Write a protein that binds this ligand. Sequence first.
Ligand SMILES: *[C@@H]1O[C@H](CO)[C@@H](O[C@@H]2O[C@H](CO)[C@@H](O[C@@H]3O[C@H](CO[C@H]4O[C@H](CO[C@H]5O[C@H](CO)[C@@H](O)[C@H](O)[C@@H]5O[C@H]5O[C@H](CO)[C@@H](O)[C@H](O)[C@@H]5O)[C@@H](O)[C@H](O[C@H]5O[C@H](CO)[C@@H](O)[C@H](O)[C@@H]5O)[C@@H]4O)[C@@H](O)[C@H](O[C@H]4O[C@H](CO)[C@@H](O)[C@H](O)[C@@H]4O[C@H]4O[C@H](CO)[C@@H](O)[C@H](O)[C@@H]4O[C@H]4O[C@H](CO)[C@@H](O)[C@H](O)[C@@H]4O)[C@@H]3O)[C@H](O)[C@H]2NC(C)=O)[C@H](O)[C@H]1NC(C)=O
Ligand SMILES: *[C@@H]1O[C@H](CO)[C@@H](O[C@@H]2O[C@H](CO)[C@@H](OC3O[C@H](CO)[C@@H](O)[C@H](O)[C@@H]3O)[C@H](O)[C@H]2NC(C)=O)[C@H](O)[C@H]1NC(C)=O
Ligand SMILES: *[C@@H]1O[C@H](CO)[C@@H](O[C@@H]2O[C@H](CO)[C@@H](O[C@H]3O[C@H](CO)[C@@H](O)[C@H](O)[C@@H]3O)[C@H](O)[C@H]2NC(C)=O)[C@H](O)[C@H]1NC(C)=O
Ligand SMILES: *[C@@H]1O[C@H](CO)[C@@H](O[C@@H]2O[C@H](CO)[C@@H](O[C@H]3O[C@H](CO)[C@@H](O)[C@H](O)[C@@H]3O)[C@H](O)[C@H]2NC(C)=O)[C@H](O)[C@H]1NC(C)=O
Ligand SMILES: *[C@@H]1O[C@H](CO)[C@@H](O[C@@H]2O[C@H](CO)[C@@H](O)[C@H](O)[C@H]2NC(C)=O)[C@H](O)[C@H]1NC(C)=O
Ligand SMILES: *[C@@H]1O[C@H](CO)[C@@H](O)[C@H](O)[C@H]1NC(C)=O
Ligand SMILES: *[C@@H]1O[C@H](CO)[C@@H](O)[C@H](O)[C@H]1NC(C)=O
Lengths: 51, 153, 298, 105, 288, 254, 116, 139
Amino acid sequence: VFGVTTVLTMTTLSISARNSLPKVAYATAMDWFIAVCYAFVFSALIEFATV
Amino acid sequence: VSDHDMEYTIDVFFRQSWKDERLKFKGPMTVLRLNNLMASKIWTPDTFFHNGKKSVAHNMTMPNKLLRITEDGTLLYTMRLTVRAECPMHLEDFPMDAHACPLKFGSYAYTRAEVVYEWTREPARSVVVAEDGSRLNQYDLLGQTVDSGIVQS
Amino acid sequence: DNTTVFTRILDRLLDGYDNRLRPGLGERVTEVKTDIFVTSFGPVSDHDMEYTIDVFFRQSWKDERLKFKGPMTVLRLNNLMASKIWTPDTFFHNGKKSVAHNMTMPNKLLRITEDGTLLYTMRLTVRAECPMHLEDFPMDAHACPLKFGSYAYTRAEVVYEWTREPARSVVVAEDGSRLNQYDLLGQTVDSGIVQSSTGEYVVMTTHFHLKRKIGYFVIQTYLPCIMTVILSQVSFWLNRESVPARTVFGVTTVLTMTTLSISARNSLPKVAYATAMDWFIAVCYAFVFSALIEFATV
Amino acid sequence: NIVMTQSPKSMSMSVGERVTLSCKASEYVGTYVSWYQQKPEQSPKLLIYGASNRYTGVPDRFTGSGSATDFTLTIGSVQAEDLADYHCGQSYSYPTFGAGTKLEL
Amino acid sequence: VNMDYTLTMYFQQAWRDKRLSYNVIPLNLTLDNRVADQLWVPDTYFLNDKKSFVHGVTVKNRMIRLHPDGTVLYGLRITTTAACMMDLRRYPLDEQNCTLEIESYGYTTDDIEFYWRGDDNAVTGVTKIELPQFSIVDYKLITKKVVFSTGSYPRLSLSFKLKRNIGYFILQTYMPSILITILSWVSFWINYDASAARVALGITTVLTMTTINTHLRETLPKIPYVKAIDMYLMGCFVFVFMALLEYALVNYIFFSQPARAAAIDRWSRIFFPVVFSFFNIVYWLYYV
Amino acid sequence: SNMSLVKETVDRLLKGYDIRLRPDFGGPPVAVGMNIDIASIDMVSEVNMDYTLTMYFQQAWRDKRLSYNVIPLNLTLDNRVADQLWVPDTYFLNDKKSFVHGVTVKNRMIRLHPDGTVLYGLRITTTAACMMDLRRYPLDEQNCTLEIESYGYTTDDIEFYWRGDDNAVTGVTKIELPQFSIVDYKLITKKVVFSTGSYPRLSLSFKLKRNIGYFILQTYMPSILITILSWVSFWINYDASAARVALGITTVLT
Amino acid sequence: VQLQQSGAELVKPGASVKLSCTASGFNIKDTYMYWVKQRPEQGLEWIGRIDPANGDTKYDPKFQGKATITTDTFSNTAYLQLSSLTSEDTAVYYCARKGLRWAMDYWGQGTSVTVS
Amino acid sequence: VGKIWIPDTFFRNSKKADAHWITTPNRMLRIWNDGRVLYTLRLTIDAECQLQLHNFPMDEHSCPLEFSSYGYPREEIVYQWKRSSVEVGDTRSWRLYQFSFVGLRNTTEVVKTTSGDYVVMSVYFDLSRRMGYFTIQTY
Ligand SMILES: *[C@@H]1O[C@H](CO)[C@@H](O[C@@H]2O[C@H](CO)[C@@H](O[C@@H]3O[C@H](CO[C@H]4O[C@H](CO[C@H]5O[C@H](CO)[C@@H](O)[C@H](O)[C@@H]5O[C@H]5O[C@H](CO)[C@@H](O)[C@H](O)[C@@H]5O)[C@@H](O)[C@H](O[C@H]5O[C@H](CO)[C@@H](O)[C@H](O)[C@@H]5O)[C@@H]4O)[C@@H](O)[C@H](O[C@H]4O[C@H](CO)[C@@H](O)[C@H](O)[C@@H]4O[C@H]4O[C@H](CO)[C@@H](O)[C@H](O)[C@@H]4O[C@H]4O[C@H](CO)[C@@H](O)[C@H](O)[C@@H]4O)[C@@H]3O)[C@H](O)[C@H]2NC(C)=O)[C@H](O)[C@H]1NC(C)=O
Ligand SMILES: *[C@@H]1O[C@H](CO)[C@@H](O[C@@H]2O[C@H](CO)[C@@H](OC3O[C@H](CO)[C@@H](O)[C@H](O)[C@@H]3O)[C@H](O)[C@H]2NC(C)=O)[C@H](O)[C@H]1NC(C)=O
Ligand SMILES: *[C@@H]1O[C@H](CO)[C@@H](O[C@@H]2O[C@H](CO)[C@@H](O[C@H]3O[C@H](CO)[C@@H](O)[C@H](O)[C@@H]3O)[C@H](O)[C@H]2NC(C)=O)[C@H](O)[C@H]1NC(C)=O
Ligand SMILES: *[C@@H]1O[C@H](CO)[C@@H](O[C@@H]2O[C@H](CO)[C@@H](O[C@H]3O[C@H](CO)[C@@H](O)[C@H](O)[C@@H]3O)[C@H](O)[C@H]2NC(C)=O)[C@H](O)[C@H]1NC(C)=O
Ligand SMILES: *[C@@H]1O[C@H](CO)[C@@H](O[C@@H]2O[C@H](CO)[C@@H](O)[C@H](O)[C@H]2NC(C)=O)[C@H](O)[C@H]1NC(C)=O
Ligand SMILES: *[C@@H]1O[C@H](CO)[C@@H](O)[C@H](O)[C@H]1NC(C)=O
Ligand SMILES: *[C@@H]1O[C@H](CO)[C@@H](O)[C@H](O)[C@H]1NC(C)=O
């Protein structure tokens, strides 16, 4: 429930944060930050799955 | 600065001055500080903003224009208007990015052999931003930078 | 030579006419007879505290300078003769941004009667202010006003009047109702004297009585709130040996109460007092929280 | 049909004091209530129009006070010629009058 | 939400003025549009419009044409935001009928007269309109006279019957609700031991119903009557609510006697899709 | 009679009248007195950093050319003769969009007096821009001002002053805002200096204190309630883990 | 400014009468014209209303169909025709002029109509 | 410009269109020795083109800007492109976020109207949607 609700939190954060920036067709710094944070959260959940 | 539209807004007193030898006079006053309805009866330069999107010229309560004629023939013509100009942004480093929003103006209908523009004071001191003149919430105005050139249309 | 006589009549009528001087400028008081035909009662915005209305606005008065004598007894003239005669300067005291329509031509009507009486009608959309008291929202009844009078002509110069009986002057059409959320109950006219920094003016007031319809807020908010309260009270019949079940019950219904309340705050304006829906939501939230703390105690 | 109830039907008083007459409507009449005075075997004369508006040619001792339903006519420092019938009539709709009010000294 | 529609039109009026008659040249005269301010043109207006304008690029978009017999042809290019009140009681399985009123303002019916030039083909370009959310089913031209307190006026009325498509509403609104109801049914296949699982599933299906309800409520005006989509959402919400309440009732009597546990479990498993499909059939047969 | 007399008087006033020139064009400055009757302050927007206000804005000066003595009364003329008189070119420095109401006609007033005094009123709805300091939002008190300046005429051609100097702005106590409350207002006379000259300025300032009940019941109470809710995690025993995880994570999610 | 009514007269039960009201000092096409009836030592009762400029009339429901009000703008007069009279019609009939915020400011002299 | 004859060109597929008036009407008139008049003005058009939103967001469109005379038919006014008709600028300082300009093509045609046959000229701009926003938003 930790992992999956953290994923839900990251998705709602990314959604609320994507609505701030205009609709550009490339990757900004905030996009890379959100992507790496999502990667870390997903990596935490897959690590739990392995354990 | 509207990032969603790649544009910014700017409220200015836009001043122009030239010399017209047909408007010489000799009276008790040395400068005629006339109305904003005398500037429609005489020649005024047709400046337009090359990157302006939808600008307004204020008309409240009277047309916010200013015409002064000096005895030797020089004319000072000032307008108050809100330019909504276009600022192309490269948002690759958002939200840690810096921009240089331009404001290009020149003459419509008058080529370089007819009408040329120049700054009335030193170029570093011609565009002057007021101190309390900042409606920016998301950015920080660092300074200004003027230039002059020629475009081949 | 059938229309040359009318051209001569119209030319003689305006020859020696000053449209800067009201009829009877230092001799009499100009009495204007007003009439309103509402063609549609537009939407009432609750977040702006305003409403929209579309009216045929008729004004009649008598100008002794516009007497004529010809083969016609009434001249039904264009909307460009009205700019060459004196017309009253009626404005709306509580208007925000009104429009006088000019599609495809200026929607104005001018009729001159041979005895000097003019009928001047306009078609215009008024966006007026309606100060609302939203204590009983969404079971509130309002009286949205529409006050008009003359700009710059005081009571000793221009006075207004209704053209028919005051209960039958402001007339609303039957199919003319663009109200989604309210119900137009009736109209109510009034006349008074306002006093401003330039003198005393006559003000013609109209009140439209609106009663909000509750059928939307019921299904939208009042029934989910009661359903969430009942769903929280469901937990009292579960066995205490299952703690995660009642735990997720309580906390998730509190979260749903939060979601419904956040959704719910976009309906009404940003008033600083508590409405009736606010009291209902507060009591329901209290019941949900009370249910959860009761679970904590058990 | 808006009905106007006037009160009281009669009033006996001496000379010089303040007197008050009341008028009530069934429906709404927003400041469209007139006050008329009719002496015996004469025609009614307009005293107060609107709800509080003295007619041109009336003394200043008559004053009107209005509302949406309750209206009143107060006469301060009455004289010897203010004895007559007094009618309140609405004009918001088709006009209806009150029953009247005799005023005697 | 605004209860209006916007339309661009080429609006043309033809009448005959004998003063603008000529015979020395054999051709029709198209004049610069600025002469329309020097001629009489009728004071046509739209009764149900909210904001109109004539286009003005590169000049004022209007046309004035004189014919040798006196016929004046006067065309405008208008973008009208006309107003029509919609009956959304069957939303989104509804058909909306709204019209554009064409009347003369100043001139009464004894001064002017309106008619359609052609009477069936006077309005063109309706079969080529591609609306993204509606589809024009029919259109009608009507000629009549209206009576106001100032006189009697001629009126024309162009009306387009619109029918709302359903292809968007099914995939975006009806499939989520149906899948949430099925995914709420899925807890019946969970045994009565795991209380946390069935409780969490039921309450989170209720939560999905609430979130979709908000994401649906962010789109429409505040109408007091119940729409078809409101009835369907309330039916789905009541079904999920009844499933969770049924689980509560089968969790209450579970300890006293376990026969009723499996009885109500299997009974719900068989009979909840049946009643839901019955309601679904009644709804799709009442509204379609 | 009494109408054609006034007609010839106004025609005499307007014949040989130069609208390009202010009163005493080559002489002392003309004094212009201001009055404002505020009708409503509509919407104070924090996202646009502006506030709309409707006002009856009146100016009064004296024009020695519009002086008559044939008739003894004051003249209220049609509002279209203000396009044939000289009116000062007053503007608002901080506005973004503004207009004179034009229903049923252009909502402006001209009024003459036998000595030469002209009264000139407009009904203006203007969206003035005021930058707010939201470091204490919503427990903040915002002070924003409307600048009234002369555009063409410098301080040696025109003079601005409040007509009354304390009762020049009326209608402030009857203004009701949904979110704020006018605590105080101030009138200021000033002279600003640009590179083109020195210009007179008047300034109307409205200090607005924001109400708190809306924000309390809308935002501050739910957060306090969620934090109280997040305390029921301790009352649950530390053996049952799933309950406490669900509770705490849902409070964080909320 | 002045409203001049006709003279008092008698009428037989079941006949018809036509009362007149001549205006002097104004034009009846500008204002409305009211007819009011007053019984001895009773309140005033409104009979009907005429708009002389247009020509449309309204009547009290009690007097609807019994009375007919008409006008003549040439002679500046207003007429009230009563038909199917009874004994309860013995009253004083007034002719009033609308004006100054719907007030009936100017009244006539009143004609006494008696039914024998 | 308002004292000589100016054609009544209008854009047939525009929802909103305005010229520019700051600081003075952005128009230009040039008359030559033999009577040739050249009239230029700056416009901002909000043209309409129905986008067939199948294959979205991997779609390509080519949607036009059309113009013709309003009152003068083919027998009165004929339009014709030059040898250097449509010229784009830098194409990178443009406000195309989700799309990318790829090219253009001109077209002339005759259209039947209730008032007559009109010579209509079209400029088709070809656009291709770049999946840089929809990628990180949804895919
Ligand atoms: C319903 O009613 C509506 C409102 O009344 C009405 O809308 C109005 O439409 C009319 C006609 O279309 C408009 O009037 C014209 O406007 C043209 C420009 O329009 C743009 O700008 C206006 C504001 O106009 C100001 O600025 C321009 C340019 O600087 C001036 O030309 C204007 O006179 C005016 O100037 C003053 O105000 C300025 C501040 O705004 C001051 O800075 C300045 O000092 C002045 O005081 C905007 O409002 C318009 O926006 C709206 O309209 C557009 C249309 O495209 C819409 O798209 C948009 O959505 C908005 O709704 C728009 O942006 C003027 O150019 C034009 O002036 C000329 O033409 C008229 C008509 O023929 C002549 O009478 C007049 O003499 C002018 O001609 C001279 O100059 C032209 C230049 O091209 C020459 O060609 C010509 O030969 C002539 O030359 C001579 O005189 C010169 C001096 O004037 C001199 O220098 C020369 O030497 C020579 O002697 C005209 O005014 C009006 O603006 C609209 N009003 C509004 C508020 O929208 C609508 O049409 C009605 N609808 C129906 C169906 O009835
Ligand atoms: C900006 O403000 C100025 C001044 O407040 C506005 O100018 C006025 O414009 C009117 C319309 O063009 C003009 O009115 C008329 O009267 C003359 C004859 O005197 C006619 O020839 C015209 O056709 C028109 O009927 C006013 O005279 C004029 N007033 C002044 C003092 O210049 C201007 O319209 C405003 N611009 C906008 C865009 O609203
Ligand atoms: C959309 O709604 C319109 C208004 O409700 C409706 O118009 C109605 O249309 C009918 C015929 O289609 C008209 O007429 C009939 O009445 C005339 C009166 O003279 C008779 O002669 C005819 O025989 C027939 O009975 C109505 O007058 C008209 N109503 C109004 C108010 O104009 C449209 O038909 C509806 N549908 C569409 C597709 O537009
Ligand atoms: C809102 O903000 C206003 C601007 O920041 C502020 O106005 C300032 O108000 C003071 C007091 O009226 C003025 O003046 C003092 O300084 C002058 C200088 O000559 C003296 O003559 C006075 O006697 C006094 O010492 C400031 O000049 C003025 N500042 C500006 C820029 O106009 C308001 O006070 C603020 N508050 C309210 C409630 O409006
Ligand atoms: C744009 O229009 C011009 C004129 O119609 C086209 O130019 C023609 O190009 C062809 C070759 O394809 C030449 O043979 C013609 O002589 C040209 N005509 C003139 C007068 O220029 C041009 O090709 C068009 N460009 C497009 C289609 O984008
Ligand atoms: C003028 O128009 C009419 C109808 O539009 C048409 O019949 C006629 O042929 C036209 N005249 C010429 C010379 O083409
Ligand atoms: C004209 O106005 C002044 C001040 O507003 C006032 O004192 C004067 O009495 C007025 N003139 C007349 C004739 O009423």
